[PDB]
Amino acid sequence: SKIPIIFGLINSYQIHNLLEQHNAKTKESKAVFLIRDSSTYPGLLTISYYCQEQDIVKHIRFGLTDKGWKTAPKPPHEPLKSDSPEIKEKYTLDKIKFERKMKQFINTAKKLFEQHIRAESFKTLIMELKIHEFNLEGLIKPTRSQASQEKHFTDYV
């Protein structure tokens, strides 16, 4: 009857309310966090937490590699109305780089996500959370109806 520790596709309002319910805003950044299915890239996991320094919720994506779960390529900073041509020209190159790297990363991550449903990959997720200094005692656990229904996570308990 065990519930996975991974959330399914939850919305931004729910993510913020879960972090606030667990007092993320009165604790150090990363002291409280949740793990959910990525809503942009199937097969990836997204860690959501509160960043005290900026007073915003932040997200970091992980995907399977041959070594286990690892940090995915990060996208370049969003365009702004105020952007100068110099900003925009650099964004072009950084966006192409991000798209190329994410394409290769997803291709490998999705193949691994699909084959080892019964997974000693779980321990490698814990390792990467530790390297990123997430307080494992601060993991928010989903209720049964909110947990991921992805088969890879059935035993992520």
Numbering used by the authors: 11 to 167
In the authors' words:
To understand the molecular basis underlying the superbinding characteristics of the Legionella SH2 domains, we determined the structures of L. longbeachae LeSH and the L. pneumophila RavO SH2 domain in complex with tyrosine-phosphorylated peptides by X-ray crystallography. Compared to the Src SH2 domain, LeSH is missing two β-strands (βA and βF) but contains a 45-residue insert between the strand βE and the helix αB. This extra sequence in LeSH contains a structural motif called the pancreatic polypeptide (PP)-fold, comprising an amphipathic α-helix (named herein as αEF) packed against a polyproline segment via favorable hydrophobic contacts. Indeed, the SH2 and PP folds together form a clamp-like structure that grasp the pTyr residue.
We obtained crystal structures of LeSH in complex with three different pTyr ligands, including the phosphotyrosine itself, a 13-mer peptide derived from the pTyr381 site of DnaJ-A1, and another 13-mer peptide corresponding to the pTyr387 site in IL2Rβ. Apart from the pTyr residue, which assumed the same conformation in all three complexes, we were not able to detect the electron density for residues preceding the pTyr in the DnaJ-A1 peptide or any residues flanking the pTyr in the IL2Rβ peptide despite the high resolution (1.6–1.7 Å) of the complex structures obtained. Furthermore, deletion of either the N- or the C-terminal region from the DnaJ-A1 peptide (DnaJ-A1-pTyr381 ∆N or ∆C) had no apparent impact on binding to LeSH or other Legionella SH2 domains, suggesting that neither the N- or C-terminal residues contribute to binding. In accordance with this observation, no electron density was detected for residues flanking the pTyr in the DnaJ-A1 peptide in complex with LeSH. However, LeSH lacks a pocket for the accommodation of a C-terminal residue to the pTyr. Consequently, LeSH features a rather flat surface in the equivalent P + 3/P + 4-binding area. This explains the results from the peptide array screening showing minimal sequence selectivity by LeSH. However, the R46K mutant of LeSH bound the DnaJ-A1 and IL2βR peptides that contain multiple Asp/Glu residues markedly better than to the remaining peptides that contain fewer acidic residues. This indicates that charge–charge interaction plays a pivotal role in the LeSH-peptide ligand interaction.
